[PDB]
Amino acid sequence: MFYHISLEHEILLHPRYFGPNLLNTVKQKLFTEVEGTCTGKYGFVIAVTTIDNIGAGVIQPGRGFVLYPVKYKAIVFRPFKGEVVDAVVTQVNKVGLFTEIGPMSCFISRHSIPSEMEFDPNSNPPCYKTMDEDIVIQQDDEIRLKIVGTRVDKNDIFAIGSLMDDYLGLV
């Protein structure tokens, strides 16, 4: 779920970068670090809007590295359990459907799919369709998937979705 927060991060600056552009280097390293980080608490990190401030750098005893605490408003995307969200199919096969919501990769199983949709291996592009064939879900389509499960994976959360609920499908 796309969101905007003000977070805090501490960065260690090697004294090599103690030049006139110290603050520029600080912000650059903050971008390089926080950008793209996925954490359990704050979900994924999409981008960094701005830097709230640069707390006074402390000089660690016995190590010239200077610790800078920096506050910064950055966009995140933390999904949940049980929320319909737009998704983009990226590959269809018999085991289940694959869809994408920004950075998060979601998928759909043969239980989450209603009983109407069936596997059609003879279909050259694998697809989920019922006897009426009213709705056919192929690759790249937009589907409404109620998230069900979530799991941290090497500091990178991945979610599992579902569409068993009414109307959850292509539109």
What is the nearest approach in angstroms of other proteins to the Cβ of residue 49?
21
Specify the residue, 3 or 80, whose C-beta has the smaller distance to other proteins. 80
Please answer whether residues 89 and 139 qualify as being in contact, where contact means their C-beta atoms are separated by less than 8 angstroms. Answer: yes
- Which of 161, 169 has the CB closer to other proteins? 161
* 38, 42, 44, 49 alpha-carbon torsion, rounded to 10°: -110
Instruction: Give min distance, CB of 158 to other proteins, in A.
Output: 8
Which residue number, 134 or 153, has a Cβ lying nearer to other proteins?
153
Q: CB pairs under 8 A, 24+ apart, for 91-97?
A: 91/139, 92/125, 92/126, 92/127, 92/128, 92/137, 92/138, 92/139, 93/126, 94/119, 94/121, 94/126, 97/128, 97/137, 97/143
15 forms part of the interface with other proteins (CB under 8 A): yes
Least spacing, CB of residue 69 vs other proteins, in Å: 14
**Interaction residues for other proteins, span 17-46 (CB under 8 A):** 18-19, 36-37
Out of 25, 90, 109, 138, the residue judged to bind other proteins by CB under 8 A: 109
**Residue 29 is inside which H or E element, if any?**
helix 22-34
Rg (CA), the chain: 22
Rule CB under 8 A: say whether 154 interacts with other proteins. Answer: yes
Could you say whether residue 99 binds other proteins (CB under 8 A)?
A: no
CA distances from 2 to 45, 48, 104 (A): 9, 13, 11
Binding positions for other proteins, 115-144, rule CB under 8 A: none
Judged by CB under 8 A, the chain residues 53 through 82 that form the site for other proteins are 56, 59, 61, 63-64, 81-82
Instruction: Give the E-state strand segments of 55-102 in sequence order.
Output: 58-59, 66-77, 84-92, 97-101
Binding residues (CB under 8 A) for other proteins: these are 14-16, 18-19, 36-37, 56, 59, 61, 63-64, 81-82, 95-96, 107, 109, 111-112, 147-156, 158, 160, 162
